[PDB]
Amino acid sequence: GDVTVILNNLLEGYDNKLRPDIGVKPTLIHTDMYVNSIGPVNAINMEYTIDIFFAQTWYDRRLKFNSTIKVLRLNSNMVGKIWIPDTFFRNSKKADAHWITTPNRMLRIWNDGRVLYTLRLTIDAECQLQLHNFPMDEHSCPLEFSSYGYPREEIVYQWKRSSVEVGDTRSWRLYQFSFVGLRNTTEVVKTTSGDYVVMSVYFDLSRRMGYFTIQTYIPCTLIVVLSWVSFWINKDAVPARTSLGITTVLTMTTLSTIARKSLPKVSYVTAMDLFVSVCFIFVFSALVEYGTLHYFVSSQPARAAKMDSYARIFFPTAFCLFNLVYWVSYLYL
């Protein structure tokens, strides 16, 4: 009817290469979001998937009409004919909008020129996780976005009071982590082209320790007590105790390989490989203890007889002390 006439009058003498007020003042853009789901945070690539509904609203004095209808509600068929800011996410490894079935976009041009432009995004953002205290570690890793070609003097972003709103926090794919909070931040960065307004949203993720427990902490200690069992077998049965020790060492190194293969290649010492190395050292100590016991049996038997009962008390006590110290130091940190 007359809405076609309005849309035709808005695009007569319209240049979609020039931002509104190109030579007057910067364009204030209000940005909102809606985090549907924060996908799996894989430590190997130091990245995490997020799915958002990015909404940008600005003022355009050229798309200003005066008719009975107050607001124009449009699909993505009029996005390529008006000006659209070139907001890009500075820490996204690979990100893309959705196109099924029709391009997921929304354009609402109010009566006074205020435009709202909403799109759906699936961003594989990047954040370098400091993999210390593993797996009792907490991260706060961001999502930063800014204009690409427009510096601070041309496009200025600004959060709304209730801008970012998480979803249900129940149907998310956060397996090993647990959402505890978020915070918005705005700063200005320097680049080879100029000064840019960079907005950020920091998500705080806390690794819940329910899986790595049964994956490495239970089998390692059970392997260690398997090694301790040799301290009760009679000292005359040599092959039994040697097999115990050496096969326990083999299983220990295999389990250490798996545990270290969990997270990526990092050149520092975490809290999990520290645990598996202490367990490996304990099994090594048990084996060399039996070796010295057997060597001393030929020289003086009572020495080894006392050594056995001494080790029976010294080994579990040292293990329990180390476990207490380690867990206290790495949990309350």
Partner: protein
Amino acid sequence: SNMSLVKETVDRLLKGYDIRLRPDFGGPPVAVGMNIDIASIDMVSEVNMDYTLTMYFQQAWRDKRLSYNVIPLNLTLDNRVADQLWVPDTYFLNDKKSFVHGVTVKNRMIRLHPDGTVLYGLRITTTAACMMDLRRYPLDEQNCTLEIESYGYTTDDIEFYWRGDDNAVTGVTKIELPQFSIVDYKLITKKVVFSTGSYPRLSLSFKLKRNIGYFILQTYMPSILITILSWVSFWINYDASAARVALGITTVLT
């Protein structure tokens, strides 16, 4: 108003413009200056013999046709006008897959200046292929680069140079790698000679040095401890034939 003036200036610049002709199509070569802001070197694979890096590749040339004097400000046009201007045919020789990121728009900048200087930036993610010499793994230093060359235009049609010659590449000292460490980086400007002509070429070469802590902790320590556990078999008396054989065999298996 100022917007009408800007609109008429841009409509004047883009009217009577031929994309098939570089600036000075008969005269001297065009001078394209390169800047690079490396965001991150994502992954360095020894199995595929390549690495992935994301950069803000930026070029700056002087197009005497896009010159204006009625307004003093630097126009920043929409990134869709780069299909109506001339931009140099710069390609990376050792790339395998690359893509300008396209969220929320095609990530490129195209900014004109009042003296004609055009500034064209991209956000590329190139999987450069660099072959490694693993004869000293993991106590080795890789030196593998990124080569930037012009495809269509020979050296009498285009000239590449770094802008600043030492600040053209930034963001290297801020890169953290989980396994490597950037020792230094070099910027080389030269010419290659193919069967069709002599073409310009730039090279940004990194010298990564591999860390040793993870390898020691993961596969050097178990080797030494298994060797010592093998030595343990010497304290066992020669009468026990089921113990020393078991120790040696299991150490071999480990």
